[PDB]
């Protein structure tokens, strides 16, 4: 089914996981290569790969208000991130947006 705005998206690319954050209307915000923060269609980001909503830490952490998640995510679009791209970094990025820093 369709993700809700603010949902973390776990993308099962062959031999590595990619993370994105759903921001609504078919769009995810995520770290990609030219690292740049991008707003793209989930359809394009997923591609032919399997993916799932994984609001992993909702059991133990409060997600931020969803309006804050989307606002913040979309604020960063266009910005380079000084750290490189691994699943852990992409995951920490989408986690920072959903839950805050901590």
Swiss-Prot record:
Localization per record: Cell membrane; Cytoplasm; Cytoplasm, Cytosol; Cytoplasm, Perinuclear region
Induction: By IFNG and IRF1.
GO cellular component terms attached to this protein's record: cytoplasm; cytosol; endoplasmic reticulum; endoplasmic reticulum membrane; lysosomal membrane; lysosome; mitochondrial membrane; mitochondrion
Cytoplasmic side: 1-102
Keywords: Cell membrane, Cytoplasm, Disease variant, Endoplasmic reticulum, Host-virus interaction, Hydrolase, Lipid degradation, Lipid metabolism, Lysosome, Membrane, Mitochondrion, Nucleus, Peroxisome, Transferase, Transmembrane, Transmembrane helix
Effect in UniProt of substituting residue 90 to S: No effect on PPP2R1A-binding. Impaired ability to act as a host factor for picornaviruses
Main location: membrane
Membrane-topology descriptor: Single-pass membrane protein
Domain remark from Swiss-Prot or TrEMBL: The C-terminal transmembrane domain is required for the targeting of the protein to damaged organelles.
Disease note: Lipodystrophy, familial partial, 9: An autosomal recessive form of partial lipodystrophy, a disorder characterized by abnormal subcutaneous fat distribution. FPLD9 patients are lean and show muscular hypertrophy, insulin-resistant diabetes with hyperinsulinemia, hypertriglyceridemia with low high-density lipoprotein (HDL) cholesterol, liver steatosis, and polycystic ovary syndrome with hirsutism. Some patients have more generalized lipoatrophy, whereas others have abnormal fat accumulation in the face and neck regions and show cushingoid or acromegalic facial features.
Protein name: Phospholipase A and acyltransferase 3
Organism: Homo sapiens (Human)
Classification lineage: Eukaryota, Metazoa, Chordata, Craniata, Vertebrata
Residues of the full protein shown: 6 to 125 of 162
